[PDB]
């Protein structure tokens, strides 16, 4: 039932309006964000709204 989970590869929309590939580290249901780790090892909170799975629709 959860759409997002720890260890999931995702695309996250950043403050420049572009998508970046990352991996979910933590899911925060209270604030509806995930801590996402990016390719440069940076980690930021991203709104659920701005996150989608990288995996093929199937």
């Amino acid at each position: 039932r959860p759409r997002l989970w720890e260890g999931q590869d995702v695309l996250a929309r950043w403050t420049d309006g572009l998508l970046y590939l990352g991996t979910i580290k933590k899911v925060d249901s209270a604030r509806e964000v995930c801590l996402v780790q990016f390719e440069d090892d940076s980690q930021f909170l991203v709104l659920w709204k701005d996150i989608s799975p990288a995996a093929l629709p199937g």
Binding site: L19, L21, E39, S42
Partner: peptide, 10 residues
């Protein structure tokens, strides 16, 4: 990855 660089997807 340390020293890695972010690029916009696709």
């Amino acid at each position: 990855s340390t020293g890695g660089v972010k690029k916009p997807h696709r």
